[model samples]
Structures are given as structure tokens and as C-alpha cells.
Target: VLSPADKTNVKAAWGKVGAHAGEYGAEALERMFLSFPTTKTYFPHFDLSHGSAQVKGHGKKVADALTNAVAHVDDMPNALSALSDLHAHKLRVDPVNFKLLSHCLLVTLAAHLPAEFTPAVHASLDKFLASVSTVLTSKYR
Candidate 1:
């Protein structure tokens, strides 16, 4: 679930990572979105050439918004709930989408930051991703 505290960490983390993180996040998200061969229609405007930059920018926007919000991890459920509701209604993106995205993010990290991609990072990422997958699936609720 989402919460003020979770938002805070998200905000702080994003601030720490800055544009580079967002760009990488976008790269991961794009790959994840593409993994959904049948559900790509929800984001038809995205592509390496046409919308790559746009995706990167949007990812930054999300980072900014999140980083500016919550203050603790416990607050994630509420914030994520709100986000999921909104996306579910407006974007029609399924919960399974997050899982696919997580896979791509690992791939992205391996491709871009192999040095920092430690086993601990991979494990934590997997856990974080599982949580996100739950949210996307409405299981977290």
C-alpha cells in the first residue's frame, strides 16, 4: 500500500538518483511495457525512436512526484493504492504489468550498472518488485 512515508522515501530516493535514475527507470519501464505483447495498445505512443525521450521524461516526472511525496516505507500501500486505482481506471494497465516491468528493470540494471548490480541489489529488487506486482494485481489491497 501507499502512504506518506513511502512517498517520502520514494521522493528522497528519486532525488538521490535524479535524472539518471529516471532515465534508467524509463528504459526499464519501456522494455517492460513492450514485454506485454498484447497490452501494448495502452501505450501506443512509446517507441525507441519516437517516444524514448518522452518515456524518459515521464519517468523523471514520476520520480519527482513520488520523491516529493511520502516520508516512510509503511506509507507505500496507501500511495500505491491511489496510483493503482487511477491507473486501473485511466490506463487500463493490468497488475501483471508490474512483474514484467521488474524483469526488465533487472535487465536494465545489468546492462547499465553492472558494477553496482550486486546480489543484494538483485534480491532487494526482486522483493520490491514482488510487492509492486502484488499492488498491480490488487493483491496488495
Candidate 2:
């Protein structure tokens, strides 16, 4: 249930993100791994030291998934069905991890692109990220 303001501001903020989405995504993950150490269990094999190659690669993948979400913001359930299933059934990721990453991603974006992310936009993005987190975790029993 994204409102008009949500879509517009999110699009604007994402437009600012542009080509830097991958970098931001990586930074977000690093921040998550650092701030919330428990989240590291999900990526034991990878090097989470700031910006490792694995982090960068997965960051890019994370950006791509968000790109998909933004594209279908109005229809996220249909859009992220595969991702949801993969996380729910195969990855078996905890909903809490999704929530933790959501905050990290928000903080990363706010830190990097302050101009584009105002308080209102912050609220919008929070709702949007919350929406994404819930959708990602919806299939979990």
C-alpha cells in the first residue's frame, strides 16, 4: 500500500542512487554485519571485512533485487514471489534478519544520500522497506 508520496519520493531517492546502488547495498550489508553481529551467521563463508569481493558481488545482487522491487512497487507480492520462496524454502532466512538489513539499508542510504532522503522520505522508505521485509518473510511459518 504505497501512497503517491511513497512512490514519488522513493523513485527520486532511487534515481539518486542510480548506478551507486551496488555500492550502497554493499555498505548496507557491511553495516548490518557490523552493527548486528548475529546477522553474520547468514554469511559465514564470505569475507565481511568492509568491502570484500563476495560482499560487493552479493551487494550487486541485492541491488538488482531491490531494482526489481522498485519496478513493481505496486505489485511486490507477484514481483518478489520467487525471491520470497527462495528465502523462505531454500535459504530459510529469519524474518528478523530481513528487518535488520532493512534498517541498515535505510541508514546506509541516509548517510550516503542525505539530500535525497528527507525525514518524510525516510518514513516512506521505512514503510517500503518494511513492506519488502514482510513480503520476504510472509511465506515463513
Candidate 3:
């Protein structure tokens, strides 16, 4: 669970994330593909290129999901239940991908918002993503 201050810092960091979040998502995906090329197996249908429109659209989807995850930080199980089902039942993505994306997102944010992603905010965001990642993969069993 997030401490009150952690939640506050997370919300503040998200606020700073602002527009261009989709672009950030895209960058994260691109970086992940570079760092873990095997992750591309999950997106065989996608172009996976940095500027590919398909990947860009999926990046927007990721951004939208994160935005909602922020909105329902305290109730992610219900808030993103449908997505969880999709991930577990339909996508069947390796939970490892979630962690990889989280790492890439952290790096993306750090690169884009060096001043905003302070140590505290980084930890908060990392925790937030970890919790959300667990929720998304919780149903696999």
C-alpha cells in the first residue's frame, strides 16, 4: 500500500507527466524492444519500430491505461479488472513484460523529466507500478 505522502508524490509526478504521455509510452516500448528483443514476441503484429503508427497507437493505449490506473490507485482490481482479464485470458503476456515496461517507463520519465522525477517520486512511481503490475498479473493463477 502507498503511504499518503507516496500517493501525493505519485499524483504530483503524474500531473507533471501531462501531455505527450503517449510519446513517452512509445519511447518506453522502443527501449524495451531494444533491451529485451524477445519481448517483441508478444507484439508480433506490431511494427515495433520507434515511429511506427501501430506502436504509437498502442503506446497511447498504454498511456490511457496508466492514466486510469492513477485515477483508481486504491482500487485497481476492480478499476482495471477488464484489462486484467484481457492480459491473463486473452493476451497471456508474460508477467515479466510488465516489469520490463515499468522499468522502461521509469527510464523514459527520468530522461524526459529529470527535474520532476526526484528520488522520492521515483520510488513512489516504482511502487505504484509494482502494485499495478501485480494486480494486472494477479489473475494468472
Candidate 4:
């Protein structure tokens, strides 16, 4: 069985993956989506001309934030509060839709990384999402 630390590490491991894989891995994924004609539909309020660039910028911010957030998935309340405050007060991201987007990304990861993916990774991601969802939902009108 994985210890709490090991479980925590699994969540943080995505940063290492993104780092070693280079920000380019995420950049590629963002660009690939933006290149699609239907990408604008997915973004709803975004400008496609700069969609990929915007996503890449946001991803870098998230990557920085998660560097510490992932280390404490078990204590999701505080993490979620911070996220809630950001989205509710700062970003103004629609709570329900934002969560839907997260689900899509989670599923995309499973589809794209099936070979290297494992139950532990899934559990950590699920826990992280669950905790954060509470914050998003609670703060959104």
C-alpha cells in the first residue's frame, strides 16, 4: 500500500512529467485543441486567435500553484478555498462549466496515457478534483 506521502507524490508527479516532458507537452495539447475549428465552442468566452497562448499561460500558472497544492490532497478544504476564491473573485470562471472542463481533461489524460496510467494516479487525480470541486461549486452562484 502506498503511504500518504507516496500518494501525495503521485499527484505532484504530473509536474515532473510536465517538466521533463517540457512545457511543450502541455503547449502541444493546448495548441492541438485550439487548431480545431470547434475549439471556440469549447471555450465559450475565449478568443480563438489567442486561445492556445492563453491556455499555455494559464497552465504555467496552474503548474506553479500545484507545485505545492498537490502535496496535501488529504487536506482539500484549504486548497479548494483558495481555488474558489480565485475563480469566484478573480477569474470569474463559471463554476459548473469549469468543473466540466476539468473532467474532460482528466478523461483525456486516461485516454492519452493509458499505458503509463495506473489506479494510484487516477485516485490521486480524483481526490484532487473532488476537493477542488467543492470550492468551485460552493463559491459559484
What's model 4's TM-score? 0.58
- Report backbone clashes per prediction: 22, 0, 0, 0
Per residue, candidate 2 scores C-alpha lDDT tens digits across 29-136 of 888898999989887788888768999999989988998898899999999998888887777898889889999999898899878778999988988888888888
User: Which lDDT tens digits does candidate 4 get at residues 32-102?
Assistant: 45544443454566544544566666556655555455555556556557776766676665555545545
Model 3, residue 83: C-alpha shift (Å)? 0.9
Residue 90, candidate 3: alpha-carbon lDDT: 82
Q: Provide the global lDDT of candidate 3 against the true structure.
A: 0.88
In model 1, where do residues sit more than 4 Å from their true spots?
1-16, 33-35, 45-51, 62-71, 139-141
After superposition, candidate 4 runs with Cα above 4 Å error:
1-9, 12-16, 20-46, 79-82, 90-92
Worst 10 residues of 3 by lDDT: 132-141
Shift of residue 63 alpha carbon in model 4, Å:
2.9
What's the lDDT for candidate 2? 0.87
Query: Please, what are the lDDT tens digits per residue for candidate 3 over residues 4-33?
Result: 888898888888888988898888889999
Provide the overall lDDT of each model, using Cα atoms, as 2-decimal numbers.
0.59, 0.87, 0.88, 0.55
Ranking by lDDT: 3, 2, 1, 4
Query: lDDT score of model 1?
Result: 0.59
Q: What is the lDDT of residue 99 in candidate 2?
A: 86
Error of 3 at 59 (Å): 0.7
Candidate 1's TM-score reads 0.66
TM-score of each model, paired residue for residue: 0.66, 0.93, 0.95, 0.58
lDDT of model 1, residue 129: 56
